[PDB]
Ligand binder design. Structure first.
Ligand SMILES: CCCCCCCCCCCCCCCCCC(=O)OC[C@H](COP(=O)([O-])OCC(O)COP(=O)([O-])OC[C@@H](COC(=O)CCCCCCCCCCCCCCCCC)OC(=O)CCCCCCCCCCCCCCCCC)OC(=O)CCCCCCCCCCCCCCCCC
Ligand SMILES: CCCCCCCCCCCCCCCCCC(=O)OC[C@H](COP(=O)([O-])OCC(O)COP(=O)([O-])OC[C@@H](COC(=O)CCCCCCCCCCCCCCCCC)OC(=O)CCCCCCCCCCCCCCCCC)OC(=O)CCCCCCCCCCCCCCCCC
Ligand SMILES: CCCCCCCCCCCCCCCCCC(=O)OC[C@H](COP(=O)(O)OCCN)OC(=O)CCCCCCCCCCCCCCCCC
Ligand SMILES: CCCCCCCCCCCCCCCCCC(=O)OC[C@H](COP(=O)(O)OCCN)OC(=O)CCCCCCCCCCCCCCCCC
Ligand SMILES: CCCCCCCCCCCCCCCCCC(=O)OC[C@H](COP(=O)(O)OCCN)OC(=O)CCCCCCCCCCCCCCCCC
Ligand SMILES: CCCCCCCCCCCCCCCCCC(=O)OC[C@H](COP(=O)(O)OCCN)OC(=O)CCCCCCCCCCCCCCCCC
Ligand SMILES: CCCCCCCCCCCCCCCCCC(=O)OC[C@H](COP(=O)(O)OCCN)OC(=O)CCCCCCCCCCCCCCCCC
Ligand code: HEM
Ligand code: HEM
Ligand code: HEM
Ligand code: HEM
Lengths: 31, 115, 74, 60, 388, 52, 388, 116
């Protein structure tokens, strides 16, 4: 279960990076 | 839980179910679809052939009546046992075996196929 | 005059010979270049992801607003 | 060989890390190719761009 | 049997798949006419596609020409009023038939296992129908058309972070003008083919797991081939539907619509009564009833979440409503609630309709929240009613 | 021997398998009606998971 | 193998059909890069459909707005020039790869038994492609589009009994006008989906009997699955096609076009050189070469008659042309004649092009009239060269 | 007419080219007859001995493997090849003659091609 949690967190990081690369909100990100 | 012999509403509900089930000549257990649960399938496999064949005959009769838009004659309606079940004990045993198998590290003996 | 396949099955040997016409063998004692192929494929995947991103953005932003309405809005 | 195996053990043990690496490499390579092609463009056609005409702001 | 020489054309490979899935598919022998309603929905979709193609042979997607082009279809084209009335009232009958389809499914609990995929694909189909009919209703470019487009597209601003961006991108230029008109024409033309694909997948999944019956019981004992036994039943249904639809086309063609769509769109004035078509009215009533428009959009999403969450319930052993008196009553109450909800959506926001809608939507979700309880108690039934 | 055997836990099993099984080369020897046995690329791909 | 519990999500019923027919369908292990063109025509069709939908979100089928709307897509829409060049050069690419598909079939005699239905469905697909490309080319409403539409649709009045009646019905009036433009737009939108359906039937028949191979021999001894062995091969094909298409989009976007189409259509003036797109040129050349225009239309019908009659010839047990020197030379002569005939179409109708096109058509039909003779004579080869 | 390589230079050249090609891929001329093509070849192959049919399948597999690998038979076996040493034409002729007789007087086809 801890390994599953780590894998899920890493996959969420990968998906977030993919969405960020697709949208390119570098201008939007103020904080 | 105060269903039987102490609840007027539950008595009325039992009366209605008896009326309908005897009207089509079915039993309550016959309403259990093997495709629904996959535990009913195992229970029906484990049950004796005579019981399973009687269940299938009753189901075929009920479907025939439903097609014809008519009910059993009053005589066969009188000679009905809507709640003389045959499946609950085997189903509970199958569920208990499943319970222990999942409880201590086991693969399911059968799984639902993704449709 | 036992057949070729029967003789091959009944006599296993460690001197195995492959075709080596359009794919030359590595010498028997050598590490497998497993990582190099993966990095080549990684570069290709770089390119494929970039192309997919280009196409999606091109279509979606084609469906977006136009210079005509942007100039009209004052 | 050693370098490839080292980067392999760095970034090819989990597929999520590999996907992140692929996306990051695609982004960085895209930006680098953009910069290189733009520098080649500037080198090739010099003296033609918009902010180069001698009278750009004297039509008033 | 070795197929040395060919016996029958139907068993030849050219007509073998068609043979199986159309002529020889075993069907429960006791089906009533609501399975005919499913087939009828398919026919309505085909009618819509054909009349829509022949209508699009005459419709101009420009803002300055759409309304007069439709009046062209009505007045100048040879038998064009028939095409337009068929398309509009056929959208209406398509929705009527799909509603009867859905409510039969609810009554007989056809969503239960193993037809969860069938029900989910049906929900996707319903979403596609909603979108297609909406974008199509925008096409004639009247007062109701333009203002309904404005409102329903501008309620997409309720998304927290990207609402305004999505609204502007979908509008294409700060309003619902010519760009939106062309966009909507293209999408309205495209979507019905995705709808055909979704319908084919729907039928394929059902054909995998057979078909339910009015008893809800296992039904592999008494099964008959689909042709000719259910083709003739479906034919009776089709002819009755044709009479109904001909009553609507020829004698009362504008009853199912609003008179405000015969005025050219004027973005300056606003008609006093902005409502969608009658078949979006229940959804509109739910959304309007729950205030705080972000909450309204969330509530629509919740409606579709509940619809998708019906199949995946826990016990639900007894299926049909013929042996479930409590669930039978619950279903009839839900149907009355849905009709009342649809009626509320056409009324203004003045009282008491706000209270009535805020009660009706709550009752809708209450139905969706009390089916598992009935299933659990029913699972408890057999060990109490034993007669010995 | 018993101490060495029960000094093996889940993490040790994972580490040893990753040393010996994860993305390594298999050697297959088959005979008989094996016309349905998958080819080398199939096994070589099955030696790792893309979900993790 | 009792499927009591799930092994592989590929073999589950949700992914079982795709598993079989895409991942696990066995194909001969010696296929060359000439089958990637069959794999690639589908990609071209998908590209055409997507770009066409996104273009139709911006095109106006009126007669006073079509050209200006296309220029609007050119200039104002962000990335619109990419969409339009993709659609046009993608029609060109679609036809290029389909011609390569057809000619590989001709070289390896893939039309022979048992793939008669595959070839016939391919011919029907070719008809659909031709009609779609033509009715789509009329859409931008340039000089070439207007006058090509006028000439070609007017040359449908060669039918003896009906003629003018069909032409008037097709035009929606007395000349190519707004009604014809709107009709052509609707038909152009519809037809590609029938083309997708025809492609699916094409693939279903081929998968029924399996693909051929360069040797033309029975090949159920050495076969491998489609994925991944042919997936990567088709990937190489797709990337090479992408490089070709990118060259033809970004550096020579109008080379395959005709400059007179960038003039707004003017029914009172005729361009000096009315010719169709480069991929209708051989058909146009045959039509013009045969005089007595009714005879030209008859010849155009006869071309498709010959194409459909190819798979139903005589014995010809050997099929691959790698073992047929005479048929190999004949095929190369046919390909050269088709290229020459395509060149002739763009030329004027003056001398000597009339004679060059009259000989070329005769050679083209002689190809079909000679192959059965080759088969009949070669039926008795083994008895003559035997080494007994 | 009947033109054989003994009485025709062009036929001699044609036979030489066919021999060269078949020897390159190492498969007899009869191996090119597809059972799916005629369904008379299917019956003729069903009537032939198992050793002969197995040799045919082995030669075809070797040819397909060589085709995939983009190479030809080595010159030794290429000189050992015997094309046009037929094994099927007599049986195919017998099958076709039997089919012709059955069709000519009454009779139903013993086998038929599916549609398609
Ligand atoms: C579908 C599916 O499940 O495929 C998995 C399946 C994996 O094989 P498997 O035998 O099912 O299981 C192998 C492992 O045990 C299990 O495989 P695995 O654990 O390596 O992962 C399989 C799958 C499993 O997914 C989950 O577990 C969820 O997970 C993924 O694919 C990971 C994707 C991660 C995100 C990428 C973005 O994929 C394939 O077999 C390849 C399919 C290739 C399809 C190609 C289609 C185009 C080709 C023709 C073009 C014309
Ligand atoms: C005077 C005497 C002059 C003699 C010239 C002979 C010559 O050039 O033969 C080359 C070659 C014949 O050489 P071959 O090895 O005897 O026959 C090739 C095999 O049939 C098939 O073997 P293959 O698969 O190696 O060859 C197929 C050919 C396939 O080549 C093509 O598809 C190019 C067609 C151009 C027209 O591909 C290649 O040659 C290798 C490059 C493949 C890259 C991928 C291309 C996919 C399509 C790209 C998008 C097109 C739109 O000519 C052709 O293939 C034509
Ligand atoms: C938005 C939509 C856009 C358009 C999408 C594509 C539209 C395609 C239209 C044609 C589809 C025709 C049906 C294809 C799927 C099919 O036939 O599946 C058969 C299968 C039946 O189940 P089963 O008997 O287990 O079959 C597998 C082993 N025999 O079926 C099933 O088990 C269920 C399959 C569901 C769909 C899977 C994909
Ligand atoms: C608590 C409800 C009690 C109940 O279920 O009563 C039984 C009644 C059956 O209805 P019915 O079959 O018409 O009755 C004739 C009986 N011989 O059931 C009913 O009348 C159904 C009431 C359903 C109410 C749902 C709200
Ligand atoms: C059997 C197959 C199915 C049946 C249908 C027929 C299929 C045919 C398949 C092959 C199609 C080949 C098409 C060839 C197109 C040739 C285009 C052409 O003629 O281009 C000529 C052009 C020369 O330059 P340009 O200045 O335009 O010529 C002078 C014109 N006044 O450019 C060049 O010369 C280059
Ligand atoms: C132009 C046509 C010229 C040839 C006319 C005779 C003819 O049709 O002969 C048929 C045969 C074709 O042989 P082909 O199929 O190419 O290769 C052998 C594999 N079957 O060709 C032959 O058998 C040709 C033998 C005689 C040489 C030409 C005279
Ligand atoms: C009239 C034509 C009569 C042909 C008579 C049979 C010729 C058979 C032959 O061997 O022709 C020579 C050659 C093919 O043979 P080959 O030299 O082996 O080619 C591959 C290696 N160069 O070349 C050919 O077979 C070319 C045949 C062309 C036929 C065109 C007919 C019009
Ligand atoms: C485009 C509209 C639709 C078409 C053409 C369509 C078509 C069909 C067809 C042909 C059947 C099989 C015949 C029958 O049982 O009536 C069927 C069954 C079914 N459909 Fe639909 N359907 C549509 C919409 C829906 C919707 C919106 C739902 C619900 C979300 C739905 C749920 C079902 C269910 C549950 C069944 C199973 C029938 C049974 O249990 O006997 N359908 N549909
Ligand atoms: C591909 C097939 C279809 C095409 C080409 C098409 C095309 C059109 C066109 C051109 C119009 C405007 C003509 C007019 O104003 O009467 C229209 C209107 C409309 N369409 Fe469709 N349509 C198609 C399918 C559908 C479907 C499946 C529905 C869903 C039921 C639908 C719902 C509507 C509605 C509600 C209208 C407005 C009715 C009105 O004019 O008042 N269409 N369609
Ligand atoms: C449903 C899919 C399709 C849609 C919606 C569509 C839509 C359009 C539209 C709106 C135009 C006019 C815009 C322009 O001229 O650039 C057009 C032009 C054209 N289309 Fe399509 N199309 C589709 C599929 C196809 C296919 C499959 C082909 C090829 C067989 C094709 C060939 C053409 C051609 C040749 C033109 C003329 C381009 C030009 O010269 O400007 N289209 N299409
Ligand atoms: C929309 C255009 C077309 C598409 C998408 C298409 C698609 C395909 C595909 C996917 C295959 C299987 C892969 C392959 O063998 O290359 C195939 C094979 C084939 N196609 Fe087509 N095709 C098209 C047009 C045509 C045409 C116009 C013909 C001829 C009239 C044709 C005749 C064939 C033949 C004979 C094969 C069998 C190839 C073999 O020998 O194994 N196709 N096609």
């Amino acid at each position: 279960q801890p390994a599953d949690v780590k894998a899920a967190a890493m996959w969420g990081v990968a998906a977030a990076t993919g969405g960020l690369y697709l949208v390119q909100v570098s201008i939007l990100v103020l904080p | 839980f105060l269903d039987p012999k102490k609840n007027w509403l539950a008595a009325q509900h039992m009366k209605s179910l008896v009326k309908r089930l005897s009207k089509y000549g079915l039993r309550y257990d016959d309403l259990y679809d093997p495709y629904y649960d996959l535990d009913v399938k195992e229970a029906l496999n484990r049950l004796p052939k005579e019981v399973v064949d009687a269940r299938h005959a009753r189901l075929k009769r009920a479907i025939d009546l439903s097609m014809k838009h008519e009910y059993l004659p009053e005589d066969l309606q009188a000679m009905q046992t809507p709640f003389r079940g045959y499946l609950q004990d085997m189903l509970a045993l199958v569920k208990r075996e499943r319970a222990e198998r999942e409880a201590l590290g086991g693969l399911p003996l059968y799984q639902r196929s993704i449709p | 005059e036992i057949p070729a396949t029967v003789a091959a099955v009944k006599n296993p040997s460690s001197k195995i010979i492959y075709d080596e016409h359009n794919h030359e063998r590595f010498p028997p004692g050598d590490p497998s270049k497993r990582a190099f192929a993966y990095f080549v494929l990684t570069g290709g995947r770089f390119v494929y992801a970039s192309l997919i991103r280009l196409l999606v953005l091109k279509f979606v932003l084609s469906m977006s607003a136009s210079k005509d309405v942007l100039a009209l809005a004052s | 060989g050693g370098i490839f195996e080292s980067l392999y053990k760095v970034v090819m043990r989990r597929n999520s890390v590999y996907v992140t690496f692929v996306i990051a490499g695609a982004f960085l390579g895209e930006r680098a190719v953009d910069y290189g092609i733009h520098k080649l463009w500037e080198a090739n056609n010099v003296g033609k761009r918009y902010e180069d005409i001698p009278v750009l702001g004297q039509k008033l | 049997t070795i197929r040395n020489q060919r016996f029958s054309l139907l068993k030849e490979p050219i007509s073998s798949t068609l043979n199986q899935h159309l002529i020889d598919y075993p069907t429960p022998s006791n089906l009533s006419y609501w399975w005919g309603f499913g087939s009828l929905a398919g026919i309505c979709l085909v009618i819509q596609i054909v009349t829509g193609v022949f209508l699009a042979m005459h419709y101009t997607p420009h803002v300055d020409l759409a309304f007069n082009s439709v009046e062209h279809v009505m007045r100048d084209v040879e038998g064009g009023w028939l095409l337009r009335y068929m398309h509009a009232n056929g959208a209406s009958m398509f929705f009527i038939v799909v509603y009867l389809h859905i409510f039969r499914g609810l009554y007989y609990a056809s969503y239960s296992s193993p037809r969860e995929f069938v029900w989910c694909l049906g929900v996707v189909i319903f979403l596609l129908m909603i979108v297609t009919a909406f974008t199509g209703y925008v096409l004639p470019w009247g007062q109701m058309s333009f203002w309904g487009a404005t409102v329903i597209t501008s309620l997409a601003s309720a998304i927290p972070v990207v609402g305004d961006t999505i609204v502007t991108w979908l509008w294409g230029g700060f309003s619902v003008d010519n760009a939106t008109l062309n966009r909507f024409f293209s999408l309205h033309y495209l979507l019905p083919f995705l709808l055909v694909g979704a319908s084919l997948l729907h039928l394929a999944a059902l054909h995998q797991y057979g078909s339910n019956n009015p008893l809800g019981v296992h039904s592999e004992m008494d099964q008959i081939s689909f042709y000719p036994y259910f083709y003739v039943k479906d034919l009776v249904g089709w002819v009755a539907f044709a009479i109904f639809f001909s009553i609507w086309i020829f004698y009362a063609p504008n009853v199912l619509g609003h008179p405000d769509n015969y005025i050219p769109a004027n973005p300056m004035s606003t008609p006093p009564h902005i409502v969608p078509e009658w078949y979006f009215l229940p959804i509109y009533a739910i959304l309007r009833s729950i205030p705080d428009k972000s909450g309204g959009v969330a509530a629509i999403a919740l409606v579709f979440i509940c619809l998708l969450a019906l199949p995946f319930f826990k016990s639900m052993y007894v299926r049909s409503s013929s042996f479930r008196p409590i669930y039978q009553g619950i279903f009839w109450l839900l149907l009355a609630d849905c009709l009342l909800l649809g009626w509320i959506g056409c009324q203004p926001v003045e009282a008491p309709f706000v209270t009535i809608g805020q009660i009706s939507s709550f009752v809708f979700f209450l139905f969706f929240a009390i089916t598992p309880i009935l299933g659990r108690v029913g699972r408890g039934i057999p060990n109490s009613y034993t007669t010995d | 021997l018993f101490a060495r055997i029960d000094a093996v836990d889940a993490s040790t099993i994972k580490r040893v398998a990753n040393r010996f099984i994860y993305d390594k080369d298999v050697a297959i020897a088959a005979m008989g009606p094996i016309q349905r046995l998958p080819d080398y690329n199939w096994f070589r791909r099955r030696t790792y998971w893309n979900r993790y």
